[PDB]
């Protein structure tokens, strides 16, 4: 079985070197073979560590969504609002006028001059009393605080979010591990009191390894950049999602129980791409993009990734989205579009119970078409 | 055999995760490996329960197309004509009226307010005389008279549209299970004195179920919908098509020769593709946005499906297409146009008889390519 | 190994439903392995019944390209002039006027226009001495005179076209079988004093039949048509040319020596697809839309298949091609345009000795790639 | 094993002919399974013959990138600096004028204007002097010298081009065998006393002759051309890579360990590229349109290749790109645009890093993805 799997799910690039066949979500389809249920006997409801959200939705924390506003209403909607402590929240005192300073950019001189603008706004120091006092506002609303940082400055800045009123760490880069040589992450998970979230990691060995940091959540993908272009590096994020949630199972096996969650990043501009999502094997969906629609959105229908400001090698773009709605609507409608891009939390009902499912977890067993 | 062919055609998407490989109508072709026969010689006539149309097409029950004057016209034509009891023919006394208003609001503003003006006219109450006085017009006719209704109402409103003259009753819905879990189907449609067709059914498991309801039969696909985009859920034709019809033969095997029809609805834009749905397994076909530009079309050239209505989550769009000709010359030619969407019945014809067949349900074996 | 192969070569669509997956030239491409040969060594030379052509190639006969001018020139320049009998010839005195009227037609109401003008042109009776008179002047100026007629009309035509002085008899429909049953052409065949080049014929079964009647060429695909959108057929050109080739294989074996030639026609505007045909098999290449381009070609630049003024179901439709070169330029070069549409010759013999090839049979054997 | 991975990487193209699946670089990405490093340990020196280049680039050998100024800032920039000895060098003293004239030709008269332009400056007779003047420029900066020779004239300009300075002769055509048949290069190779880069070879056994010549390095590829569209030959790059690999693994085994390097041209327009490159198996690379947009570059932003000039049969055609950055920036960075095309090295090493690997060698092992 595994010998002609193996065969099959393998090709031959050329004499001596063999590729192994990876899948998208967009290859992908979910299948109805059960009886039909009723979408409001559908249990969206995500319980990881102490918490249980609504939603199993978090945004993706850049500033082009979250302001401090931005992050409370995420929370008062029924998801997990994410800040970017390493973004412009504690680099420039009116965060507004950053923002627009990238849109006109955009605007004015397209994605070049949004790049460079991001580049120098990026540039300008980390003021942690700033940053503190941001957090503190997110922290008086009474939402869970959910607060990201870079792989290369965790040490460094996640003892002063913990401080601020940071209840869960995310640590995200569009690719980590949890062995980095230079010229550990356990020891220093196991040291804080929060619980943590660690990603992207995109194989079945890094989760794995991660998982085995004490980590509570992987997140699996790199969120929106460039790197198919720029590094030939291009996550199937199907398959990537199975391989780590084979990875969950086996963690799950080691441990005698321990359940850690896996939050697909990349791929998901629509409802149907997070109900794919979750078929593959994810417990919670990273919504990035089709939230910059929203009203209270900082970027005002911009988008862009953190990696859009790297000095030396930026990864990511500017996009713009194509009245704008509340976050309310986006996540719980009513829709008024039929693309897949408001009431999300509608769509996913709907398909779990069109499949014959009434929660995640066993949604991650319904049939696939791949097509 | 099973095991290799099994091997073939599933997918390891990730690390114990697989996929079924599916296909749709646009992956697959018609071959031609016998002496060719004359297209005079080629009958088209569709014989299911105690009717015999000329023609094996009905069309879908959408008011963009059904008028009663359309759905007369389909009946005079040749074909099937259906009736959506649920759209706007019982809500609005001016029927052309609220028709005007849709493509007011497309044209004006986009699918937005489309979508909007769709959502307003269906959640208008539904008057069930007026609704029985439209009817009673296609009834008087002559033509035979098919109602739909949605699988969610079909108790409350069948009873109304059998008396008001319905001689088939269409339970449609873009997808349809014959038990359904909320918070049966057999003794319901047992009860009834008229032939019953439902669907969307996609399945092989689905579609046997749904035969033993005593339904004649089976509606293959979703008709048009964004549900790929909002649910994940893509049909593939071909495939659903083939299933369904393996239902079909292990049905008639285990009745004794009780043969339920399958139509097909979704993925058909031209000729090409409902002879490739015959093909596939299908007895007849429903005709929907190829016939919006005939000239009795209700909707001027626009089309919708009812879901596109949705209060909530519409999954649907207003399309509209690319002098008007009449639905005869649609479906009956000359054809004045090469692109397949004028003169069905000739394609169909000149398909069969290219391919050494005169009867649709011989031309079910006819040699196929993937391309 | 036939096993196996076979399992590779099909896909199940559906329980109970396979096809065979098939392949078009786009889909392949020629590979050298060997030592590089010259050009200038490259042997490009038709060698049919009786017959040496310096370029293994035809004109599709449409008269978008044959006027009686063009013909001449095709021979002139080394290839095989072809005649349409049934088309304008015949039907109207002034031959540049009808063409001038289909042109008008489609700038002035696009492919509506176009289609309606060229039905009613072909629809005007045929005048046979009329025809004779054209066919006389291309008898006349020495080059050999092919000349096609229709399956439906050969018995009537292909003795007034012969009396008129035809060298070869083409027989083109767009799919061609040995024996039709209505409501033989061996005998036909074997009757006239001139060889006869039949098809279309893409399948082993019917071109074995058709060279059983004495045919010299079987002509593989149909030309330009809307066959995909009206038929759901789409001829997969480079493995109907394999399979003619394979049955060319056998009938070789059966009768001990007779040759009969592959001549395609379908999927080729460049010289790559040419050479992609000859090495799936072809003897020889039938040009359309390509030549429409030269300064001699009657249609000024555009082009359409005869079954675009089929009164019913028409099946083809008028292009526009994107100074007009000579037909000479088109052939021989020298090319000014590095996409393959001038200096056929060039392309072909360049092609060849690139791969380590010297003429076009051997050619036949050339590695393949799928990409 | 090789049964069943044959049976699995061929097709059956049609009775009794069959062709090999292959591989583009745009169907395959890189896969980090590793714990990742720092980019600042990875070592992308190229070591060859007598050299050692800070990057392991070379430019395309066309006009269009190659003035002398921009040959000396490639190697200033710690790449290869290759010459046309065949292009505009020796046929017109003034070469900018030269250059302005195609690029007038392009904005003017689109491609046709441009390849006619192309022909005619190419047509112009070889000053041998005029070339070994420009040479000695190049050669005068201290940089190292290459220049690029036809396979047809190698024999007559080899001798003028190493006198003239040259430290390293590149034989490159499109496509290039060790042996050609006409109407050996081992000896011509073995009598230099340069070191010889020989290409294009996309095949094993081509290689492995070639190798077999005294090659130092063999180029896999065509660099930019039509040959897809003129002579029906595509190359698959990433299979041509791993094919070439594969003979210089034997080669290395045959010799005893002489290693052979495989510079890939064809396909590469962005770091991205690159990386899948060296992955394939390429030591180095050919960078030719992404350079154009230099400010050193001689054609200001336009691109072509050396067969765009073919006075008979043109195989390329003239690009524009879509201020100008120094070719510093290009190769180096800081990269202001993410789309992979400025900062290569940066990419390159960025890519490795996040892979797990410090040098490129090793990096022919990574893991690789179909999609």
Redesign the interface.
Known sequence: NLY??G???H???????????????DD???????????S??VDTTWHIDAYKFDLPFMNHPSDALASPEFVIEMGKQGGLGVINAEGLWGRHADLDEAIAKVIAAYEEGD??AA??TL?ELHAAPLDTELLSERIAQVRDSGEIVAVRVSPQNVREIAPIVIKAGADLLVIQGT?????????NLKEFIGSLDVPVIAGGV?????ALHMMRTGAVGIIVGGGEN?????????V?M??????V??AR?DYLDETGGRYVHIIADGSIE???????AI???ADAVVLGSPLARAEEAAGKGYFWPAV?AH???????VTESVAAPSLEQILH????????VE?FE??LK??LA???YTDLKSFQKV?????
Chains 1, 2, 3, 4 share one sequence.
């Open positions: 002609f799997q065969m099959r799910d090709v031959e690039i050329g004499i001596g070197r063999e590729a192994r066949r990876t899948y998208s979500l992908i389809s979910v299948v109805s073979s059960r009886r039909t249920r009723s409001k006997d994605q070049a790049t460079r580049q690719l980590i591990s949890a062995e980095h040589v230079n010229t995109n194989d079945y060995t890094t460039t790197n198919s272009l720029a590094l030939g590096m291009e199937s199907a398959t990537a999602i199975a391989d949630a084979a199972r629509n409802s149907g791409d997070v109900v794919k078929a593959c094997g859009a000095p030396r090698f930026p990864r990511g773009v409608g009513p829709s008024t579009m039929p693309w897949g009431n509608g769509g709907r398909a069109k499949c014959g049939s696939l078409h791949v097509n």
